[PDB]
Amino acid sequence: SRKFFVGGNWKMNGRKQSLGELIGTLNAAKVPADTEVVCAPPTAYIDFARQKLDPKIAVAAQNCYKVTNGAFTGEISPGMIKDCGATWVVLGHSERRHVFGESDELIGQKVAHALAEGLGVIACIGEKLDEREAGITEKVVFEQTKVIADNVKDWSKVVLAYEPVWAIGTGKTATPQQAQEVHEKLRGWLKSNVSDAVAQSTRIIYGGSVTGATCKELASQPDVDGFLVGGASLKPELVDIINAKQ
Amino acid sequence: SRKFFVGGNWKMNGRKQSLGELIGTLNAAKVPADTEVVCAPPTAYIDFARQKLDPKIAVAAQNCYKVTNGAFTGEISPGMIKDCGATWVVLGHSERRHVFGESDELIGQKVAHALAEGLGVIACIGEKLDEREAGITEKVVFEQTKVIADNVKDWSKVVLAYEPVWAIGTGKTATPQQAQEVHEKLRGWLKSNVSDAVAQSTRIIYGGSVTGATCKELASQPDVDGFLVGGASLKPELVDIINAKQ
């Protein structure tokens, strides 16, 4: 019992005009009954996107901080995210980790607080190129996942996203088999360290390169439960990725 | 001749209902013609704040990034800020620098991009208790101001904010004479290093502790042209600070 999950990470892209247009497209898309869809707009447009999107698509913040209110110029809290109608937050995204230096310690604390506040969390992990080539893929993503698990009580509110950071802009790419390998090792970590129950019911989505051309082969991997989509999430092509199991 | 400037930095505080109430109070108060008022809401509420606020009050983003669009989950661009109807961005705020580790070099790149896109910039500088008790206040704030200056081609759209980070949350308080000392030295830096034109026209606002009772005296200091208000900007007290010259 794992419902197919497709998250669209718009990253720092779009304006009210172009996003309005894209939202119109998605509002007309037939989202399958077996599929849960979430879009993560730029923080300035969480409000806008929730107002314009049809309820069949949930809204995620791309990040948040770890307290409800405070002297943290530039941050938003899970309270504000809910106040705008979003029900998810993306935490630990590769860009937060490796461009903006967000530690594991910090990400775990955001997870605890987002969960305590009633949000769903799309919790991202994954290994860089140096790490993969040293043999420490397992170590790196287990450690990352351990830190997230320490701050989760209710796993029904969590989706794990594997980001093959080693394959992003590096000269390397991941095969569907390489994706499947990491996802079944992560499910083995959940079964081992949490419960078979949690393992069987927790979506592990793929956060590497995915397009309309590649989504069916990726979605048919037994341990790949969906996608955290980058570039293609800004295009009608997102609808094709949503239809991946159909 | 230099226009009195009050920036209200709401930091990570408020929800649509509470901010709606404060916005009501501000809309209702009369801003003196000789003063320029700007409010910086949490980033989730830039759009909301702009729509609720009277045109007499300007809206600022609390931070932004240094390209127009890109793969930066969690960030917003000056284009987005403008798209939301905001005309200012706060950059280099002590929380960005010291809680979130934003480098001077990063902050310079933001100033450059923000200015290029047509946004006003409230650029923040200041020394820690570390650096003041080491007698290197001048070195720190001038070096900070230099990096900013290197990424400004139009000073008409820049306000400098001195934040006495040494005297906020530390147990130490700053006197108006200590405020004036740094502000005078900053203006003299601009004279030496940019132009008399810039030195004489550039607002240097005070970002240390401002209350309804401390504001008149701070305001009368000749090189203190306004304030970047913390806690008091969330209260009707902001009105008193806006009226500090009256």
UniProtKB/Swiss-Prot annotation, chains A, B:
Chain positions found as Phosphoserine: 18, 77, 103, 156, 195, 209, 220
Biological processes, Gene Ontology terms: canonical glycolysis; gluconeogenesis; glyceraldehyde-3-phosphate biosynthetic process; glycerol catabolic process; glycolytic process; methylglyoxal biosynthetic process
Metal-binding listed as a keyword: no
Sites bearing Phosphothreonine, chain numbering: 170, 211
Keywords, sorted A to Z: Acetylation, Cytoplasm, Disease variant, Gluconeogenesis, Glycolysis, Hereditary hemolytic anemia, Isomerase, Isopeptide bond, Lyase, Methylation, Nitration, Phosphoprotein, Ubl conjugation
Pfam families: TIM
Record PTM N6-methyllysine, positions in chain: 191
InterPro entries: Aldolase_TIM, TIM_sf, TrioseP_Isoase_bac/euk, Triosephosphate_isomerase, Triosephosphate_isomerase_AS
Top-rank taxon: Eukaryota
Pathway field: Carbohydrate degradation; glycolysis; D-glyceraldehyde 3-phosphate from glycerone phosphate: step 1/1; Carbohydrate biosynthesis; gluconeogenesis
Modified residues (3'-nitrotyrosine): 65, 206
Modified residues (N6-acetyllysine): 11, 153, 191, 235
Matches recorded under Gene3D superfamilies: Aldolase class I (3.20.20.70)
Main location: cytoplasm
UniProt catalytic activity: D-glyceraldehyde 3-phosphate = dihydroxyacetone phosphate; dihydroxyacetone phosphate = methylglyoxal + phosphate
Catalytic site positions: 93 (electrophile), 163 (proton acceptor)
E.C. no: 5.3.1.1, 4.2.3.3
Gene Ontology cellular component list: cytosol; extracellular exosome; extracellular space; nucleus
Subunit structure as annotated in this protein's UniProt entry: Homodimer.
Family affiliation: Belongs to the triosephosphate isomerase family.
Protein name according to UniProt: Triosephosphate isomerase
Protein species of origin: Homo sapiens (Human)
The organism's taxonomic lineage, starting at the top: Eukaryota, Metazoa, Chordata, Craniata, Vertebrata
